[PDB]
Amino acid sequence: ITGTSTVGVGRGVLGDQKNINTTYSTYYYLQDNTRGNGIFTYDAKYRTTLPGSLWADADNQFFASYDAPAVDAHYYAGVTYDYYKNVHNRLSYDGNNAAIRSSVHYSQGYNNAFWNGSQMVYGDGDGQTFIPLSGGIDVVAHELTHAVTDYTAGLIYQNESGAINEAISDIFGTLVEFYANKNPDWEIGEDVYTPGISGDSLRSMSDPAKYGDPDHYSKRYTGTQDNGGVHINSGIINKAAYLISQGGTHYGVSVVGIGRDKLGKIFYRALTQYLTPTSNFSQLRAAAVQSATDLYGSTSQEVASVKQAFDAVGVK
Ligand SMILES: CC(C)C[C@H](NC(=O)CNP(=O)(O)[C@H](Cc1ccccc1)NC(=O)OCc1ccccc1)C(=O)O
Ligand SMILES: [Ca+2]
Ligand SMILES: [Ca+2]
Ligand SMILES: [Ca+2]
Ligand SMILES: [Ca+2]
Ligand SMILES: [Zn+2]
Secondary structure (H helix, E strand, O other): OOOEEEEEEEEOOOOOEEEEEEEEEOEEEOEEOOOOOOEEEEEOOOOOOOOOEEOEEOOOEEOOHHHHHHHHHHHHHHHHHHHHHHHHOOOOOOOOOOOEEEEEEEOOOOOOEEEOOOOEEEEOOOOOOEOOHHHOHHHHHHHHHHHHHHHOOOOOOOHHHHHHHHHHHHHHHHHHHHHHOOOOOOEEOOOOEOOOOOOOOOEEOOOHHHHOOOOOHHHOOOOOHHHHHOOOOHHHHHHHHHHHHHOEEEOOEEEOOOOHHHHHHHHHHHHHHHOOOOOOHHHHHHHHHHHHHHHHOOOOHHHHHHHHHHHHOOOO
16 A cells, blocks of 8 residues: 555564554555565455455554464565575575565464465464464465575475475575574474473474474385375475584484575575576585585585585485
8 A cells, every 4th residue: 555654562472562564544564665565464364365454454563363373474575585685695585576465364263374375364263273374484485485496496296395485494494593592493384383282392303203304315204185285295495404404413424414594595595506406405405506516615514514414315
């Protein structure tokens, strides 16, 4: 909408107060004009028609329970935009400052979130399996990274290319969580999963097998569920990325860690310059090795650690 940029205040899903960029024109809207062509957050009003209505509020204060998922979808989209711009010199998900659109209160008791090719969508959860999923900065950045992938490699969402697609979203979701530096970890979704259970999460990058996901190519899922295991076999690539950053010895293979910033640079370059819609795991290894060669040199530690990490998870 056309209006003047303002700053509201509210509480997120976890009860934390934050300021949010809004727009005033009769109402205060969840429209952040400070980032690209805008960040826009919508109310889907428990239906599945999208996007719903641009979020409007009478007083620019967002402290109601119903407001909390919108506050966090809006704010964490902004943090994710800031990460890609400041760290990778990428302007929004298309590299040309495309408007970022999110809808919250999607359906009733919906235990998921997604990028639909046009916008981000967040369920509220059923209150037992999940609380509203925009409360997780790693989840929000996971979804926005699917959009980045859509405009770059275009990894098909099936089998190995889909598991790379998923792992890319978990990797950059986690790197955004570290960027914001509030309780960062290598787990996915811990802030919104199972409010009745402390210490768990949807997935672990540091130890995927904690939640039954494979951590070695020899243990990959080969059936048809989950689009051929895209959220299962992502564990193999997530573990490799974790090893590249943090190091460790895994199935007897030692990896020298090179840190999160270099992990992000290597995988961002792989995603944007080498991966294609049908890339498989072996091709991802080749893209990551080439990317680290470009950035650090063929004889570099960084290149050696990428090779070790893929060796450790059985990907040649
Ligand atoms: C218990 C759950 C929460 C755990 C897991 N989900 C996630 O970890 C986060 N959602 P997510 O993985 O982001 C989304 C999943 C989806 C797919 C289809 C329909 C609805 C939801 N995919 C997604 O948005 O794909 C984007 C894409 C679009 C086009 C091409 C390629 C990818 C699960 O769904 O099992
Ligand atoms: Ca209000
Ligand atoms: Ca965390
Ligand atoms: Ca996390
Ligand atoms: Ca929990
Ligand atoms: Zn995903």
